[PDB]
Point group: C3
Chain length 333, copies 3
């Protein structure tokens, strides 16, 4: 009755991928919620595997290189993430749930994931492409670049740096699909189209509906459910009305319900191997904003592990006459 | 031109069905709005039939029995509600509009309604099943149980209590349909499926669309429009973004528009006999929250009585030349 | 690659069409945003043509006539708007973008537009019909009447006034289509139906979906894309959740996404000649409300000029090896 009976939980408090302080509190925002209690109530055994400790260099140790900010913190953090994720993945099936942390963590989680499962596919749920190459990034923020280091067809656009040697590109462009895009930089658009990356923007969601979008995205990168799935979910893919506490909010996003449909369908493939939830920042917005964002996150992560909005059956059906209590029906004799 | 030319309005300020103070102000929240003025402007004669006075026992008079809180207040209130509702229903057709009050009132309104119209059907619009049997309720809150006392197929799960004798089960499981469910307890799911109660969750709304959901719900319990309809609308069926002032908000609800489509279609059957609106609590949230919730409620109740978003025709068409005023067209001679 | 490579921007700070102070700050709310910067980044040359200065008579100069408030301010303002708009339109094609200002400005913008392009059609995006004739207006507010002075079939319902002589009716009822209606006065409904004006209410959007609604609206008034389009967009057509800072908010409106689809499809006809955005009032609501409303407006206006949510291609593709930088791919030799 359960597709996944156990799962692992991992925190990654990255905050050097972007300038707003507070994404490091992401994992704690979910640990303080009722997420663990709710997942236990659906009968899933969830093991907390702790937090990964990011490498945060002093400013003097990590100057800008090719416009990138904190790039040495990034390379070192990426290798440390990959090792731990690889270990957990090599250690039905047991999904790994990861809570960020800004989205720069994805270079490491996927690198590590791909080590254990080289044939995986990636579903990237995001308002943004996160695939700027360093010389094209207007900001230099690493959370806007994590896919460009992973995609093989892009490596003539990545500047060589010796500390990036261990970050080997493990994805073909044919293995990635986007859902929810609405704020692409022109150079991301060029690369996505040039190398044929499957992508479904909010325009596509409006015109096709999310059911057909989810279907087409799975067909494009996992046509027969043969591949492990890495689901990389930026909370800002969701409309700011339901996920306001995030650093780069873009209006006109996914409703919570559309976000749940994505997670529900991906969960039910049986192939969900890693889900990561990025860009929660509880230091942004009002207290009510933070509670809305926390709530949307918890509902999203529960859907990934298999929670069904149509309800769950009890493990043991309770009966009145078994407790030696007279029912109304019984009394009417 | 009017399906219903008159209607009755009844307040039921129940607040012992759940622990948060303030549902007793529900009827006043609607009486203070412009609802009466707006319904008059569409040409409907609305008669205010006052409030029912709930029986609220002192704590010492009403101890917990089988985990239920305030169960004697509930049985006594239920019988008092049923008598008044039966009277009003026996007294086209004239819909009764009821404003709660927490949802525990429904055991009484339906009991009373069914006395006058034993063949009725129930459309239950709610995030929740409200059909916990007493021994399965985690909370003991009566607003989470009103249907379990009414449904015939469940009576071997209701503990006998002498003061509950006059609460006779008047519904078959085949007469109830749910729309909007997204937070079912496992034992409700068991009972709903075991006894074949028609139900459409937010998953079904996402996959089928609300038009097909409404259609299938009416087909399931009122296939040829032969039966009177009791529409029991929990305001928390609506998304918290539009109805925040309610005690058990659940994210990912019905949009206001989907809520209006339900009410518009039910109204246009000609069979709307009672509509009740439960769980308004103006003591929850900010002032703006309360105004949003009040507004959503007023729009919902107007749709039930037949308000059309596509507009209404005037009772008397006004003409300029009849007031002896020269028009631009006339002057151009 | 660009349907429109240049455009004009015009402010019209009307505020005598309705009693709430603050619509005069509408144009500044958009000038302070990043709208100009964003439109430049998509490669469009946008020329700011300044503001039109409304005629705001002293109260003693402009008494009520036929219940109308500030009607002489209105007639004088309308003629001044029309002259400037006619001039700009006579001066691919170059869309005029107009930011209000309350919606009473539309009598002048369309009058002026029609002078330059007498065969145009009008797409009116609004919660309201804005077509009350003076003797039927409950309020006397001119922003609720701008279409009644323009529509030829209505001129026996317009009271003659000598200062209104230069406001000649330039629209046939067959040239106008509404989208988003949900708060029609009974006499507007009568006139819209009597004279066969195409209209799509929120009921129609719910039942048909916005894609079919947009399609049917264009078919009704511009079946072969032969006519110039005047797009008159009241910000209150959008749901109050995304455009709260406006004077007559009505719940259950267009989502931002549905609003974008309207603008995207109208833009892509190639026939968008004027778009006006009315009823922004930054003196209403909280600071956050104002920022939400500003944001929704900016996204709407960018879609009108051709912004694509699916992304834009760079004007010059950047290449790493052209900057004399060794790529990772290159280094791996
Ligand atoms: N595309 C921008 C924004 C990325 C935002 C990531 N959440 C960049 O590369 O920096
Ligand atoms: N299912 C829960 C919540 C009910 C909430 C009713 N509005 C219960 O039985 O108490
Ligand atoms: N229909 C009303 C409201 C118009 C509101 C315009 N934004 C009137 O004529 O005054
Ligand atoms: Mn993002
Ligand atoms: Mn991202
Ligand atoms: Mn409920
Ligand atoms: Mn309820
Ligand atoms: Mn309007
Ligand atoms: Mn308007």
């Amino acid at each position: 009755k359960l597709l996944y009976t156990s799962a692992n939980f991992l925190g990654i408090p990255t905050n050097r991928g972007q300038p707003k302080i507070g994404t490091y509190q992401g994992p704690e925002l979910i640990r303080k919620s009722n997420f663990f209690q709710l997942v236990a109530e659906d009968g899933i055994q969830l093991t907390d595997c702790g937090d990964i400790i990011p490498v945060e260099l002093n400013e003097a140790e990590d100057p800008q290189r090719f416009g990138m900010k904190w790039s040495r913190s990034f390379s070192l953090t990426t290798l440390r993430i990959a090792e731990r994720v690889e270990e957990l993945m090599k250690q039905k099936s047991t999904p790994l749930v990861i809570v960020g942390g800004d989205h720069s963590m994805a270079t490491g989680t996927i690198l590590g994931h791909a080590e254990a499962k080289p044939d995986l596919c990636v579903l990237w749920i995001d308002a943004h492409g996160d695939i700027n190459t360093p010389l094209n990034s207007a900001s230099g923020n690493m959370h806007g670049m994590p896919l460009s280091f992973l995609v093989k067809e892009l490596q003539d656009q990545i500047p060589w740096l010796d500390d990036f040697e261990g970050i080997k590109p493990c994805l073909n462009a044919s293995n990635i699909a986007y859902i929810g895009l609405r704020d692409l930089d022109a150079h991301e658009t060029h690369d996505i189209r040039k190398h044929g990356i499957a992508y479904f923007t909010m325009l596509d969601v409006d015109r096709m509906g999310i059911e057909a979008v989810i279907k087409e995205a799975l067909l494009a990168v996992n046509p027969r459910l043969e591949k492990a799935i890495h689901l990389s979910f930026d909370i800002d893919a969701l409309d700011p009305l339901v996920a306001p506490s995030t650093g780069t909010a873009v209006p006109g996003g996914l409703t919570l319900r559309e976000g749940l449909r994505i997670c529900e369908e991906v969960s039910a493939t049986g192939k969900l191997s890693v889900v990561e939830l990025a860009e929660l920042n509880p230091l942004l917005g009002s207290q009510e904003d933070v509670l809305k964002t926390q709530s949307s996150a918890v509902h999203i992560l529960r859907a990934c592990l298999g929670h069904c909005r149509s309800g769950h059956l009890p493990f043991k059906v309770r009966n009145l006459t078994d407790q030696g209590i007279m029912s109304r029906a019984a009394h009417m004799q």
